[PDB]
Amino acid sequence: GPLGSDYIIKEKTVLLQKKDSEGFGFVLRGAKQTPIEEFTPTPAFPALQYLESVDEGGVAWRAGLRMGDFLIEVNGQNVVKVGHRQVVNMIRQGGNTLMVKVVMVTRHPDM
Amino acid sequence: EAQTRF
């Protein structure tokens, strides 16, 4: 809008249940965070980790996750401000089960 | 940034 950016914000929480001999079918990308300054989420940059890619037809894809989704929670733990290695460890904790909350942000262009 | 496939 004339006074600032407008965004569509869509939250998605999914329960992923994979087989032993497959992956969940996504690549997580994000920061490893600085103790010096707290991360402040914004609509454009809502979390430190996001889905760099999602395998079409894979487990995550079939549940509704998409490339570009930002990761908010893993198995009931908030990860908005959490570094990459800890989030990886949290995801691996559940084995073949992973429940995540992500958010998809789309900036509605004015022109 | 790091990345990890799942």
Data resolution in angstroms: 1.8
Domains belonging to chain A, first-starting first, are 6-108 (2.30.42.10)
Residues of chain B neighbouring A88 (CB-CB closer than 8 A)? 4
Q: Following CA atoms A25, A11, A73, A44 in sequence, which dihedral angle do they give, to the nearest 10 degrees?
A: 90
Block residue for tokens 């760099």: A52
Distance from C-alpha of A55 to C-alpha of A109, rounded to nearest angstrom: 28
What was the elucidation method?
X-ray
Residue of A102, A17, A97, A26 lying closest to A57 (CA atoms): A26
Structure tokens at A70: 């930002």
Beta bridge partners of A104: A10
**Considering only alpha carbons, which residue of chain B is nearest residue A18?**
B6
Chain A residues with CB under 8 Å of B3 CB are: 27-30, 52, 84
Neighbouring CB atoms inside 10 A of A25's CB total 21
3-state helix, strand, coil in chain B (%, to 5): 0, 65, 35
> Which backbone phi and psi does A93 adopt, to 5 degrees?
-65, -40
The secondary structure of A53-70 as a DSSP string is EE-TTSHHHHHT--TTPE
Q: Which residue in A23, A32, A98 is closest to B5 by CB distance?
A: A23
